[PDB]
Structure 1
Amino acid sequence: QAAELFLDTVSTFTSYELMDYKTFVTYTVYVSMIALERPDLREKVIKGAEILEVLHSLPAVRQYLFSLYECRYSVFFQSLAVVEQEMKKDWLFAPHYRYYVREMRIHAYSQLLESYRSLTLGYMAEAFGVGVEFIDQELSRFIAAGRLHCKIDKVNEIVETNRPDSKNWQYQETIKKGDLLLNRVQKLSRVINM
Structure 2
Amino acid sequence: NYEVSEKAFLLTQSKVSIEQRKEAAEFVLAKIKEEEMAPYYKYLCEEYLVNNGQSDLEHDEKSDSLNEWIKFDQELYNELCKKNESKIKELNEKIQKLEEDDEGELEQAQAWINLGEYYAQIGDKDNAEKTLGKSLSKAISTGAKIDVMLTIARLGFFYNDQLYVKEKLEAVNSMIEKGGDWERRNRYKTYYGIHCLAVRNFKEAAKLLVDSLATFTSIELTSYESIATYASVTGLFTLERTDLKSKVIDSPELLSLISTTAALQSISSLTISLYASDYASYFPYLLETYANVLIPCKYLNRHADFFVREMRRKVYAQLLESYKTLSLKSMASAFGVSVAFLDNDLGKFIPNKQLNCVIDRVNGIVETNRPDNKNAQYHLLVKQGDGLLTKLQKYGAAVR
Q: What TM-score do you get using the length of structure 2 for normalisation?
A: 0.43
State the partner residue of 2:359: 152
Is residue 2:330 matched to residue 1:126?
Answer: no
Cα distance between partner residues in 2 of 1:4 and 1:23: 18
Instruction: Please say if residues 125 and 132 of structure 1, whose CA atoms lie closer than 8 Å, have aligned partners that are also in contact.
Output: yes
Greater CA drift, 178-187 or 109-118: 178-187
What is the aligned counterpart of 2:342 among 112, 135, 159?
135
State the partner residue of 1:49: 252
Q: How does 1:1-194 map to 2 (within 5 A)?
A: 2-5=205-208, 6-9=210-213, 11=215, 14=217, 19-57=222-260, 58=262, 61=265, 62-86=268-292, 87-165=294-372, 167-192=374-399
Compared CA separation, residues 176 and 97, structure 1 to 2 (3 A): same
Compared CA separation, residues 15 and 151, structure 1 to 2 (3 A): closer
State the partner residue of 2:144: none
Instruction: Please say if residues 60 and 79 of structure 1, whose CA atoms lie closer than 8 Å, have aligned partners that are also in contact.
Output: no
Compared CA separation, residues 190 and 55, structure 1 to 2 (3 A): same
Instruction: Please say if residues 2 and 31 of structure 1, whose CA atoms lie closer than 8 Å, have aligned partners that are also in contact.
Output: yes
- Secondary structure of the equivalent of 2:206? helix
Cα distance between partner residues in 1 of 2:349 and 2:272: 25
Cα drift, residue 40 of structure 1: 4.2
Cα drift, residue 89 of structure 1: 1.6
Which structure has more relative contact order (CA 8 Å, sep 6+)? It is 1
Instruction: Count how many residue pairs are aligned between Structure 1 and Structure 2.
Output: 192
Compared CA separation, residues 94 and 125, structure 1 to 2 (3 A): closer
Greater CA drift, 173-182 or 161-170: 161-170
Cα drift, residue 166 of structure 1: 7.3
Cα distance between partner residues in 1 of 2:330 and 2:379: 33
Cα drift, residue 38 of structure 1: 2.9
Cα distance between partner residues in 2 of 1:116 and 1:22: 40
What is the letter of the counterpart of residue 46 of structure 1? I
Instruction: Please say if residues 326 and 367 of structure 2, whose CA atoms lie closer than 8 Å, have aligned partners that are also in contact.
Output: yes
Cα drift, residue 180 of structure 1: 1.3
- Secondary structure of the equivalent of 1:117? coil
- Secondary structure of the equivalent of 1:180? helix
- Secondary structure of the equivalent of 1:122? helix
- Secondary structure of the equivalent of 1:56? helix
What is the letter of the counterpart of residue 43 of structure 1? S
Cα distance between partner residues in 2 of 1:184 and 1:59: 48
User: How much identity, in percent, do the aligned residues show?
Assistant: 41
Cα distance between partner residues in 1 of 2:225 and 2:378: 45
What is the letter of the counterpart of residue 7 of structure 1? D
Q: What TM-score do you get using the length of structure 1 for normalisation?
A: 0.82
Give the RMSD, CA atoms, in angstroms.
Answer: 2.7
Cα distance between partner residues in 2 of 1:55 and 1:16: 20
What is the letter of the counterpart of residue 73 of structure 1? Y
Structure with the higher fraction of residues in helix conformation: 2
